[PDB]
Structure formats: C-alpha cells, structure tokens
Design an enzyme around this catalytic site. Structure first.
Site, PDB file in Angstrom:
ATOM      1  N   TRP A   1       0.814  -1.206   0.000  1.00 25.91           N
ATOM      2  CA  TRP A   1       0.000   0.000   0.000  1.00 25.91           C
ATOM      3  C   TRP A   1       0.851   1.260   0.000  1.00 25.91           C
ATOM      4  CZ3 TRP A   1      -4.485  -0.624  -1.848  1.00 25.91           C
ATOM      5  CH2 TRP A   1      -5.177  -1.823  -1.623  1.00 25.91           C
TER       6      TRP A   1
ATOM      7  N   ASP B   1      -1.283   6.876   6.172  1.00 28.38           N
ATOM      8  CA  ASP B   1      -2.384   5.979   5.844  1.00 28.38           C
ATOM      9  C   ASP B   1      -2.631   5.060   7.032  1.00 28.38           C
ATOM     10  OD1 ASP B   1      -4.151   4.076   4.895  1.00 28.38           O
ATOM     11  OD2 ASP B   1      -3.056   3.755   3.015  1.00 28.38           O
TER      12      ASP B   1
ATOM     13  N   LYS C   1     -12.332  -0.917   7.206  1.00 32.67           N
ATOM     14  CA  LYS C   1     -11.627  -1.785   8.171  1.00 32.67           C
ATOM     15  C   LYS C   1     -12.204  -1.583   9.654  1.00 32.67           C
ATOM     16  CE  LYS C   1      -8.544  -2.217   4.647  1.00 32.67           C
ATOM     17  NZ  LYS C   1      -8.459  -1.444   3.352  1.00 32.67           N
TER      18      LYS C   1
END
Ligand SMILES: N[C@@H](CCC(=O)O)C(=O)O
Lengths: 355, 347
Positions: free
Chosen positions: A98, A168, A192
């Site tokens: 990511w 992030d 999430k």
C-alpha cells in the site's frame, strides 16, 4: 467469525441497529437513505458522527475532519494535489504494497523521494529512523501505518522535525489511542475499523489547507470539503451514517483505550500460538508485527487446502492469505472479539495435533 | 409520500428486501456490507447490476458502464480530465444552475465555449439549436438534460455531427426510453432517480477512453475503472448493490417504457392543476417543462407558509423550493406513484 482483511466485519450490534431502523429512522417515516443531506435530521446525524470521531481520538480543534468518497486509493492523488507544491519534493516511506501504491500515484504529481524501504529487511522489519534519508524541506513525509497484506505496522511515530507527517491508517485507525497533534494529515478508508466501503476519513491540520495546485478538482480539494462540512456536493449519506453507528458503538465499548487492551490481548494470543511451534510461521520481527493483520503460513503448504476447508467447516472464514504472499492471514479488527481469536487458535491446535 | 428532489425515496419493496437481508444475504451469514468486492458473490451482484442496467436502457455493446463515486459534481472535473485535450475547446450549454456549475469547473481545465444560454429567455425556455454557436472542432458538447432546480428539461437531442454529446442525466435517467447511441457520455448521480447517494453511473463510448491528460488522477480516469470493472480499488459496494435492487425492481415494473407511461401521467396531472387557475404559477414553457421536477410559485408568496403547513399536515412532504429558487417544487421520480400526485393536487 469473519477474518477478512477488507471490507471488514462490522459489529453485530451495529448491523442489528441499522437494520431495525432501516425503513423508519426514529419513527420519522423515512430511511436515512431517503434523507436529504441538507435536512435537519441528516445534518444532526453527520455533525454527531464528526463529533464522536473527535471524541474517540481526542482530535484537537485545529484539525478538520472530512468524510469523503473514493476510497483510500483516491487519497494517493488527493494528498499531493493538496499538499505537494508543483516544484517541491515529498518523502515517502516504503513498507509494503500500500505504501508503494501511494508512491506510484504521487510520482505523477511531482518528485518523490523514497526515504526508507523495508525491502532491505525483506519486509520482515521496518528500517529504524537512523537509516532514513529524509529531505530537509520536503512538503511532507508519507507512510502507511499498517501494511494490511504484509502484516507490518509502525509501533512508533516518525520524528520529521517541521515536515508535516502524512499517514495511511486505513487498517489500524481507532484500534488504539493516537496522538493526532503529531500529524499533518491522517487518512483511513473506512472498510476496516470505521465502517462501510467507499467512505474515507481525512483528519488534517487546518494550517495545511488552501494551497491545492490549480489542476486539483474542486471535489478533491480539502479546503472545499472543510469549508462545506464535507457536503460541497452530495456525500455518501448512508455510509457516513453507518460510521456514526460504529463511533457510537466504539464509545459504548470504552473507546480507543479499551480497543487497545482488547486488541493487544487478541494479537498476543495468536502470535503466542504461532510462535509456539514450527508448524505455523510468521516471519515478521516482533518490533513491527501488526496487531490488525496477522499473516502466517503452515510448514507443509500441501496442508493449505485442508486447513482452509476445516476452517470453513468450523465458523472461521476468510483466512486465506493474499495471493502475493500465499499461506494464511487472520485479520482481527475492532469488530472481532477475543472469542474469535480463541476459536481460531483452538482450531489451529486441533489441526497441528492431527498433522 | 416523499416529494424530495434528492435523494429520491426508494421503492418500499427495495428497502424491505435490503432490510431483510442486511445481516445474512441468502443464508451466507454475511452482510453485503461485509463482502469483499473481489468475492464471487459480490462479483455476481455487480455484474448483474451492470447487465440489468444495460438491458433497461438498451445500452449497445460498445459502451462501458461504470459505477463510480463522488456524486454527479465530480463528473464536472472528470469529464474534461478524460475528454478534453489541454490544447482544445469544449462547448457547454447553459440552462440553469447545474449546467453552469459544470461550466465553471471545466474552465479550470481548458477553453470553454458557452454555445447557448437560457438566459435570454429568463430560463423559462431552452434556446433551439439554430440559435446555438457550436464549435466545429470541439472535443464535446455538454448539457444537462434536466435542470433539477429550474424544472427545465430537454425533450430533444442536439445534433452536433461528429462532436461527442456529453449529458448530465442525474434527474431523468431511467424515466423514459433513451437512445444511448446518440451520446458520447451519459452520467447520473444515483441519488436522484435511482436512490443510493454517493454513487454515480457513467455510460461512455469505448472509443472515447484512453486519452485522459497526465494530471488526471488514476481514480478519476475512466479507462481505469473500465479496464477493472469499476473495481481498480474498493467501490461503494452497498450503494452498487442497492442500485441493482432498484434495477431489478424496474424490470418487474415493466421497465423504462412503463416508467414513461407513468411519469407522463404524473407530470401531466400536476401541470394540469397549475395551468387551471391563476392561484399557482409555473413559468416554464410547455415544450421544456420537466417531467421529473415541477416548480411552482404562489400568487401570494406571503401565503407560502400555510401551503407548507397543510402539506406537512397531510402526507405531502418536502415541497419547499431551493434556497436560490424561491417558491415550491415537487419531484416526481420513478418510485413515486400516481397516488402521490393524486394526493398532492387535492391539497
Ligand atoms: N450476523 C453476523 C454474522 C454471524 C455469524 O455468522 O457469525 C454479521 O453479519 O455480522
């Protein structure tokens, strides 16, 4: 018991609540889905979600809290569009898949300096800050708090002097207390711990707004969202509402302090089990083992199919590892209790015994 | 009874189905909210939503159907970012608020020629095409088929030669038959005539894709969502599923021809009432009177407060007009039955 890495399990109580009032919110005759986002009712729902989020994380008043759309991936463009001057430099930290996707999208907007990379440790550890090559007047430093696939997570907040930190936290926000004042911008795709897909939360220092480059769309401009209560246009109204239910649920559970204690115990139990024998393996150094995403493999990969079939025979779903790594992966976000990890670890023991 | 401009009320059948299976979709012990978009169950939901839409509007095979996020507003930037070369010109048609918003955003990405304006007609009518000043070498021509605030709607399609037609159909898509082949790109915020907020549908000719300028974000590049089945990253999974329920429902109701018959009735009924007396006023010429949004003023605007009260009293809700408008407005989208307009004309 749903161990999926994302979109993630929602707490039963949240879904039960949304379900019960889906046709008729507070007896008004309307679904939240049918509400105008400019109505008094919806404004109160939205404003309360924002406030509950400030309460959970103790967000200081000089931060804006934005409810945007487009997923965390859209932030990979929104961040440099808003915060990276056309001739400037951004530092990025590579700790896995990511953070590498964030890097790639930023290159299209200006110069990226990759200030550290976990590849030197084959992504089993995070390079300590002494090995970093930060740029002195970088516009910001970007890292992914938690690499969802790699199971690699920062336990610590980087010191970057006067360069704003950008992080992030899609996969570990609200899992534990967080000193928001350390950051220039925090963002999280909601699927999430925050809630429903599509929705993205951005927490950003007010003094960083207002410098979006001219080619930044109006709808991707933080200042425009901030100035309009995240309602410059029509927001994802149901998703925003749902995340409000989650924030309320989090508060009633005892907030991020309680999540920390629960998530620590969950993470400890599963890692303890893996480290016990050489039948299961997680190669991530303890210093950076994610609390949220726990990759592991079996010694004999020929037993993968049986493991997953038995796991599905019990109530233990979606333990299959990401295709880039193989093996298994237990994601154990806020919505999963210790009982979930207890049931997983019990099956793992049963399986080891037969094999 | 919900005369709200946005979002549209959802059909009770749809919400009830959505409620019934919110926790346990088809016995799988899982909410659609909790399904990975890459999973086979969700893949089938999304494909079937796409396919049902293709069936509903009779979309030809050389059109991509994208399920995006960010509201119709975001298309104001995505369109020029994908379809307007940096050294080029786009023609825009001004018929009211939303088409002007679209213009102002476009100007940030290149040269915009406003080839026509309803301004000359006080936005009470649309300028016929022979009044237009189209650009021969234009990348596209953008207009809004239905000005949601102003009750101003196209009943005709502009003939612009080899220049692509780009149209905002947020408020009228799926309300009538549509000749998709006439258009380069159609887009619609879902909230207006489908129901789910946030989600945007874009219907775009395959051969228009692939030319987005370097500064276009990956996530705002049509080719990206096209090559990845609108799933380069995580889509708005619930809203997509909901919109699929609505598509299923539309088929059950006789589809888009049946919607046309019903909406013409509702439209004609409300308009018959307003043109009957001097008590209410709609200034929009009959040729451009919207079927979807019907604004009307009170002869004595000082009597607007008891109009609303006696409406909140009865079943008729959300009839107040935009802050900028001044007056009343009824939105008679697909999910609203004739009984609602019947109920309204009475009070
Ligand atoms: N109703 C639960 C699933 C129950 C279970 O199968 O364990 C949920 O969707 O959150």
């Amino acid at each position: 018991f749903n161990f999926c890495a994302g979109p993630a399990a929602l707490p039963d109580a949240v879904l039960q609540r949304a379900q019960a009032e889906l046709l008729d919110w507070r007896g008004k005759g309307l679904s939240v889905m049918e509400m105008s986002h400019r109505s008094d009712d919806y404004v109160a729902i939205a404003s309360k979600a924002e406030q509950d989020l400030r309460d959970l994380l103790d967000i200081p008043s000089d931060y804006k809290v934005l409810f945007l759309q487009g997923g965390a991936s859209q932030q990979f463009a929104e961040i440099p569009l808003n915060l990276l001057p056309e001739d400037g430099v951004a530092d990025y930290i590579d700790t896995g898949i990511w953070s590498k996707k964030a890097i790639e999208e930023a290159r299209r907007y200006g110069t990226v300096n990759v200030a550290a990379s976990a590849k030197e440790y084959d992504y089993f550890a995070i390079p300590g800050q002494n090995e970093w090559t930060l740029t002195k007047d970088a516009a910001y430093v970007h890292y992914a708090s938690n690499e969802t696939i790699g199971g690699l997570e920062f336990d610590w907040i980087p010191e970057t002097g006067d360069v704003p930190l950008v992080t992030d936290m899609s996969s570990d926000i609200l899992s534990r207390p967080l000193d928001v004042s350390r950051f220039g911008l925090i963002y999280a795709g909601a699927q999430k711990n925050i809630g429903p897909s599509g929705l993205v939360v951005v927490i950003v220092r007010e003094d960083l707004l207002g410098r979006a480059r001219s080619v930044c769309p109006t709808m991707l401009n933080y200042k425009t969202a901030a100035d309009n209560g995240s309602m410059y246009n029509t927001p994802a109204t149901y998703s925003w509402y749902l995340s409000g239910l989650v924030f309320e649920w989090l508060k009633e559970q005892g907030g991020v302090t309680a999540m920390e204690q629960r998530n620590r115990a969950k993470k400890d139990l599963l890692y303890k089990t893996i480290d016990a024998s050489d039948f299961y393996t997680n190669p991530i150094q303890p210093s950076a083992r994610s609390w949220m995403n726990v990759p592991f493999r079996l010694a004999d990969e020929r037993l993968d199919k049986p493991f997953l079939e038995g796991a599905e025979a019990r109530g233990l779903l979606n333990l299959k590892g990401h295709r880039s790594v193989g093996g298994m992966r237990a994601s154990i976000y806020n919505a999963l209790g210790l009982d979930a990890v207890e049931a997983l670890v019990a099956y793992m023991a049963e399986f080891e015994k037969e094999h």
